[PDB]
Amino acid sequence: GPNPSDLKGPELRILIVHARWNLQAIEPLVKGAVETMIEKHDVKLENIDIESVPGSWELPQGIRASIARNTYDAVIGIGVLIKGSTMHFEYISEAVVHGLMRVGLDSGVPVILGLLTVLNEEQALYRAGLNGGHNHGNDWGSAAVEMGLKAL
Amino acid sequence: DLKGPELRILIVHARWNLQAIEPLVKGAVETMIEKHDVKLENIDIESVPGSWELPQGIRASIARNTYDAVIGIGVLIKGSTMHFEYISEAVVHGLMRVGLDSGVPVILGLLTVLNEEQALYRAGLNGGHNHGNDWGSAAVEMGLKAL
Amino acid sequence: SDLKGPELRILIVHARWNLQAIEPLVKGAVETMIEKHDVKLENIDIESVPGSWELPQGIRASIARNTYDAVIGIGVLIKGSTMHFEYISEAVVHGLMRVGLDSGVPVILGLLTVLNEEQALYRAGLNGGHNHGNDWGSAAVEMGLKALY
Amino acid sequence: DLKGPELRILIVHARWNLQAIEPLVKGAVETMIEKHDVKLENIDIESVPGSWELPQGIRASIARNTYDAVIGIGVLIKGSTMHFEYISEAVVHGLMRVGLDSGVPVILGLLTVLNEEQALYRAGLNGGHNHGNDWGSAAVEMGLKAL
Amino acid sequence: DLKGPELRILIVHARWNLQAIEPLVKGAVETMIEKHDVKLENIDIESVPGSWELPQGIRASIARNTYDAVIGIGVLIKGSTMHFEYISEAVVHGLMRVGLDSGVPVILGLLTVLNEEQALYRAGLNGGHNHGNDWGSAAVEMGLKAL
Ligand SMILES: Cc1cc2nc3c(=O)[nH]c(=O)nc-3n(C[C@H](O)[C@H](O)[C@H](O)CO)c2cc1C
Ligand SMILES: Cc1cc2nc3c(=O)[nH]c(=O)nc-3n(C[C@H](O)[C@H](O)[C@H](O)CO)c2cc1C
Numbered sequence: 108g109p110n111p112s113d114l115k116g117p118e119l120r121i122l123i124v125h126a127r128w129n130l131q132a133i134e135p136l137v138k139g140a141v142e143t144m145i146e147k148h149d150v151k152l153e154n155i156d157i158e159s160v161p162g163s164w165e166l167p168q169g170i171r172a173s174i175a176r177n178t179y180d181a182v183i184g185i186g187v188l189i190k191g192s193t194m195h196f197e198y199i200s201e202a203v204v205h206g207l208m209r210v211g212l213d214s215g216v217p218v219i220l221g222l223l224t225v226l227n228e229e230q231a232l233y234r235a236g237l238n239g240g241h242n243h244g245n246d247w248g249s250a251a252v253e254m255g256l257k258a259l
Numbered sequence: 260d261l262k263g264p265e266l267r268i269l270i271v272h273a274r275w276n277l278q279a280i281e282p283l284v285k286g287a288v289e290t291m292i293e294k295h296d297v298k299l300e301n302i303d304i305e306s307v308p309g310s311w312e313l314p315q316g317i318r319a320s321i322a323r324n325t326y327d328a329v330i331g332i333g334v335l336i337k338g339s340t341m342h343f344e345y346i347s348e349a350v351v352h353g354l355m356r357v358g359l360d361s362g363v364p365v366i367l368g369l370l371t372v373l374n375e376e377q378a379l380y381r382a383g384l385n386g387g388h389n390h391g392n393d394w395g396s397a398a399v400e401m402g403l404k405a406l
Numbered sequence: 407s408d409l410k411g412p413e414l415r416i417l418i419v420h421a422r423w424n425l426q427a428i429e430p431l432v433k434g435a436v437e438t439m440i441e442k443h444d445v446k447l448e449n450i451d452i453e454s455v456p457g458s459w460e461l462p463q464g465i466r467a468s469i470a471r472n473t474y475d476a477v478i479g480i481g482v483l484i485k486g487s488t489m490h491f492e493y494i495s496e497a498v499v500h501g502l503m504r505v506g507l508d509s510g511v512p513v514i515l516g517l518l519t520v521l522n523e524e525q526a527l528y529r530a531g532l533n534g535g536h537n538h539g540n541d542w543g544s545a546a547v548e549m550g551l552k553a554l555y
Numbered sequence: 556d557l558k559g560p561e562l563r564i565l566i567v568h569a570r571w572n573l574q575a576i577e578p579l580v581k582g583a584v585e586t587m588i589e590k591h592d593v594k595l596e597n598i599d600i601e602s603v604p605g606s607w608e609l610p611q612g613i614r615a616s617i618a619r620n621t622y623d624a625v626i627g628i629g630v631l632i633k634g635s636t637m638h639f640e641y642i643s644e645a646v647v648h649g650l651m652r653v654g655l656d657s658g659v660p661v662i663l664g665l666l667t668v669l670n671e672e673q674a675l676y677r678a679g680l681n682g683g684h685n686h687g688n689d690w691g692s693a694a695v696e697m698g699l700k701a702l
Numbered sequence: 703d704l705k706g707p708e709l710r711i712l713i714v715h716a717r718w719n720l721q722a723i724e725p726l727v728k729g730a731v732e733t734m735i736e737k738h739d740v741k742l743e744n745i746d747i748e749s750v751p752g753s754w755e756l757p758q759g760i761r762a763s764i765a766r767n768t769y770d771a772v773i774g775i776g777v778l779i780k781g782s783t784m785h786f787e788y789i790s791e792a793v794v795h796g797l798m799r800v801g802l803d804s805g806v807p808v809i810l811g812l813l814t815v816l817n818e819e820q821a822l823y824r825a826g827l828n829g830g831h832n833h834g835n836d837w838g839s840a841a842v843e844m845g846l847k848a849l
């Protein structure tokens with residue numbers, strides 16, 4: 108499984124952009140990422156910006172717009188895509204993931220992937236720390252801090 | 260709660276499967292006007308032959324005029340060949356690229372369905388929800404956040 | 407379409423694998439542009455390349471040499487015993503989208519990605535099918551005009 | 556008949572599955588020389604460990620010297636993992652990119668097969684047709700059309 | 703018989719599945735030093751949380767220092783969601799991009815497997831061949847050919 112770090116980033120500025128489809132799963136993820144950065148990495152509450160966009164499709168664009176306006180040491184993109192009856196899931200999952208990798212590489216700002224691509228709601232909730240699962244948001248918080256520091 | 264009386268929105272839609280396209284365009288327009296105070300004269304509506312032309316039509320139009328947000332609308336239905344799989348992927352990638360290259364929010368109004376029924380259901384027919392409404396709200400929201 | 411493009415310059419690049427299917431497609435695109443959209447025969451350049459893989463590159467080279475208002479890329483890819491079909495279908499389609507977006511010139515997709523010969527011939531107007539080359543011709547004129555005017 | 560006595564051709568090939576690679580390189584070279592009058596000293600041949608390095612080895616080489624066309628040759632065989640699926644796609648994409656970025660025609664000589672037999676058959680063994688010959692002609696034609 | 707006593711090599715590896723990663727890194731390093739005369743001081747070893755961070759970690763590092771070649775090592779195992787499919791593809795595409803953008807050879811040391819056993823087997827355990835050895839030799843070769 109994952110192997111996080113014990114790094115401190117009191118001076119890091121971190122941006123979190125999350126979609127709003129499936130808020131039930133999004134909230135615990137955001138909260139986990141924030142709590143872990145503060146309590147475990149000494150990031151300051153004032154240095155964490157939180158923005159939202161309607162859906163996962165908008166994540167790469169929202170992130171790109173925000174890092175052009177302000178300066179961040181790392182960004183976490185959070186969203187939940189659930190397979191439905193159409194091929195929508197397959198095609199936008201791929202476009203969004205590609206989009207996030209591009210924004211990070213174009214800008215030089217680490218973009219941490221907080222995108223869940225699941226078959227059903229249960230899988231999402233389970234990865235958000237509910238029903239006995241592990242909250243992946245925590246890992247994302249630690250990844251952001253680590254990448255923020257290594258980025259300089 | 261978001262109002263954009265000064266927003267300029269572009270809507271580019273393909274012409275294959277007009278039966279499903281029209282309700283989507285209409286739903287988007289009605290929602291922006293009636294619920295976000297966008298002005299009818301501030302909404303440009305253009306069309307292209309098919310979904311393949313969507314990225315290019317949008318790229319050309321945003322180079323000519325200035326818009327706060329764009330909605331690309333089309334309907335791709337799986338057929339007997341592999342056409343559907345390969346162009347769906349290319350068109351979706353194309354739309355993301357035009358949005359990122361230009362800095363202009365591009366809202367995805369592309370239905371990629373197995374059959375006609377699925378598209379109509381997502382256009383508000385037969386008891387379904389009209390996704391066009393969601394796209395209009397998204398365009399307004401992204402347009403405002405874009406500044 | 408009631409659109410006329412007597413001043414449009416159109417480029418058609420087609421591959422040579424499966425000429426049986428390629429010819430009717432090219433022919434249908436040309437005849438439609440001329441007879442239905444008043445494009446002038448002398449304003450239509452026709453070029454060929456060995457295979458679909460070369461399509462994006464041939465188009466990129468040609469639109470850097472001359473000026474065109476719209477381009478139509480024509481090729482036929484048929485599923486074989488290897489994964490060749492799946493991988494290059496995807497790369498070629500992506501390449502044609504890229505060339506159109508990089509250059510600003512409308513690229514009409516005239517690429518058939520079929521499971522067998524019959525599907526391609528049918529889409530070329532044979533055996534009771536509709537010739538897709540006609541639609542491509544009309545799309546190139548429309549996009550050419552909207553490219554500018 | 557296309558003749559290119561003044562063309563400079565580059566051939567970069569991987570080294571995994573040499574049994575299939577050699578005949579492909581050989582067919583491409585023999586065909587350019589014997590049928591298109593390309594000069595032996597005008598053909599550079601380079602190798603890289605595997606297919607993954609093909610795009611990078613080609614990019615490096617066309618930055619150093621000037622070539623009219625390039626042929627990238629390699630063989631990918633489906634194995635037990637998903638490696639085949641993911642690098643086949645990335646390599647093919649990488650080869651298309653290098654060609655478009657540079658303006659130098661890149662001919663695809665990458666076989667993506669399910670097993671060894673399929674690759675040998677396409678290299679001209681066991682009653683099959685050597686695809687290397689086709690690639691040689693394609694490079695000459697694209698080399699001349701590139702100017 | 704390639705020797706690169708003056709080569710500077712960078713190795714960036716993720717930390718998911720350390721059980722498989724360590725043997726891979728070790729095989730790569732040992733092979734470069736014992737078989738290609740690369741100096742232990744000239745090998746930088748960095749890590750990142752997961753495979754998703756590999757392309758970015760590598761890009762940041764080759765912007766700071768100068769390396770003749772890079773090896774990106776990570777292990778992606780198929781799970782219950784579609785995560786594996788989507789990020790395997792994006793990471794592989796990402797690594798090819800960083801290598802083509804920068805001009806620095808990037809050796810793919812990414813295992814995309816269906817289960818833990820497949821990964822350990824490819825790391826030289828349970829009778830398998832250590833793929834890290836192959837990657838170390840590829841890096842030396844591409845580093846030397848890169849000039
Ligand atoms: C049919 C359909 C299904 C969608 N499913 C999701 C989903 O599961 N998760 C998500 O974040 N956004 C989803 N979206 C929203 C998408 O990311 C975006 O807001 C819209 O396509 C318009 O840009 C969906 C949109 C559509 C039209
Ligand atoms: C065989 C075939 C099937 C097509 N199916 C669709 C479709 O379902 N929806 C759509 O908007 N366009 C479709 N198109 C049109 C495509 O987006 C484009 O206009 C044309 O390929 C010419 O560039 C299709 C074109 C072809 C050749």
Ligand SMILES: Cc1cc2nc3c(=O)[nH]c(=O)nc-3n(C[C@H](O)[C@H](O)[C@H](O)CO)c2cc1C
Nearest residue numbers: 421423457458459482483484490662663686693
């Ligand atoms: C195994 C194999 C199958 C091919 N199938 C097609 C096909 O169906 N259509 C086409 O235009 N070209 C095809 N090509 C040619 C390809 O588009 C191209 O010319 C060359 O592969 C690299 O120049 C094929 C090439 C190979 C090696």
Ligand SMILES: Cc1cc2nc3c(=O)[nH]c(=O)nc-3n(C[C@H](O)[C@H](O)[C@H](O)CO)c2cc1C
Nearest residue numbers: 569571604605606607630631632638809810833
């Ligand atoms: C598990 C595995 C399977 C591979 N299979 C192939 C293959 O079928 N063909 C090929 O040219 N290279 C293959 N390679 C090598 C690849 O092209 C490249 O040299 C290395 O991955 C390091 O970049 C493979 C490498 C690995 C680790």
Ligand SMILES: Cc1cc2nc3c(=O)[nH]c(=O)nc-3n(C[C@H](O)[C@H](O)[C@H](O)CO)c2cc1C
Nearest residue numbers: 219220250716718751752753754777778779785
């Ligand atoms: C559901 C899930 C599965 C993951 N699986 C892997 C894996 O198999 N290998 C790996 O290196 N990283 C894995 N990661 C981590 C990923 O590469 C990355 O570090 C994090 O998503 C933060 O951007 C996974 C992350 C998630 C959320």
